[PDB]
UniProtKB/Swiss-Prot annotation, chain B:
Protein name (record): Protein mono-ADP-ribosyltransferase PARP15
Superkingdom field: Eukaryota
One CC-aspect GO term: cytoplasm
Coiled-coil parts of chain: none
Family, per entry: Belongs to the ARTD/PARP family.
Annotated keywords: Glycosyltransferase, NAD, Nucleotidyltransferase, Nucleus, Repeat, Transcription, Transcription regulation, Transferase
Full protein: residues contained: 481 to 678 of 678
PARP catalytic domain boundaries: 2-198
Known function: Mono-ADP-ribosyltransferase that mediates mono-ADP-ribosylation of target proteins. Acts as a negative regulator of transcription.
Length: 194, 198
């Protein structure tokens, strides 16, 4: 069940599709980035069409929608990374086994400006920086802490019934951490400069 | 997609089903265990019916079967663990982030044994305060594998010039495999829990 806005892949399962500037889709993604990164220069935006990652993600979304007995389990977040990690993320998504103050998971920012820090979106030998726009199954979350390897339980009376993710601040989150494969789908890759 | 042999779970997502000795399902697992663990005695064998783990596992299996083309991608292996880990494994499966360092490390992942004797070591299936030891029988997507290395946090590439095209798992010895390491969630489905004693 590949999404309607994807483009044909000639019977293949993985493609990076460069977006046409000025079209509805490109405009939407660029605006999410310029809300906090208007001082940067966008070189291109690519749609990630990874059928396998999408299928595993959508299975997890359907399960989380059942478990939590509502939708509203998904957020669009940012992830800055180095050039050498981009091929892996495009093909395999996010891997917690690759500062982790809120737990040993994959970190996602609410604001592109956070992911735009050189510590995350490391400029490559050519000055290029890389940031993903990511569908993240944040679900029901709680405050994180150092050394978590999974989210805490929602009630220590049932230690296996877990929060879906953790954050820095439940009332006004700025970051989320997820601790499982296929809780995050890398949807767009922004290539940009300072 | 739930298997038709499973008990009806009345819209519940999870159940453990105690098997009966003399059924082929029980006997095949007891024989697989006793081939290398005849000095131990089985208390019970439970079928793990975990709808969400099954769904995610079967998605990964279909993907590996597509990608590899006509490989036997799935092996039935053993995993010994401590009693404190059993509720988590039953509900959530095998988390590499929780895995112990193996005495012979072929990577930083979850380990699965070919022989029940390996998993039956107290270092894995730690006896609980009542002398009960716990071993899972696990469907593992071993796929295409190579000899592992202690530094791995994912399987190595098949080709160093294409670093994202990975082996599916690693092993101690490709000609005589006795352990497999997997590095991804939902690559192993806990199918049976064997409770056993000396
Ligand atoms: N890779 C990313 O885009 C990214 C990396 C890290 C991150 O948050 C890390 C963090 C940890 C503790 C305190 C703060 Br404020 C931020 C948020 C996002």
């Amino acid at each position: 069940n590949l999404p309607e806005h994807w483009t044909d892949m000639n019977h293949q399962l993985f493609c990076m599709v460069q977006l046409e500037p000025g079209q509805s889709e490109y405009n939407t993604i660029k605006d999410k980035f310029t809300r906090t990164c208007s001082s940067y220069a966008i070189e291109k935006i690519e749609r990630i069409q990874n059928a396998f990652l999408w299928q595993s993600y959508q299975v997890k979304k359907r399960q989380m929608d059942i478990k939590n007995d509502h939708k509203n389990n998904e957020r669009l977040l940012f992830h800055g990374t180095d050039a050498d990690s981009v091929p892996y993320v495009n093909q395999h998504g996010f891997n917690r086994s690759c500062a982790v103050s809120y737990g040993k998971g994959t970190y996602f920012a609410v604001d592109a400006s956070y992911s735009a820090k050189d510590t995350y979106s490391k400029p490559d030998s050519n000055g290029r920086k890389h940031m993903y726009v990511v569908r993240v199954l944040t679900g029901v979350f709680t405050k994180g802490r150092a050394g978590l390897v999974t989210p805490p339980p929602k009630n220590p009376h049932n230690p296996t019934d877990l929060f879906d993710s953790v954050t820095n601040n439940t009332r006004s989150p700025k970051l989320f951490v997820v601790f499982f494969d296929n809780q995050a789908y890398p949807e767009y890759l922004i290539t940009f400069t300072a």
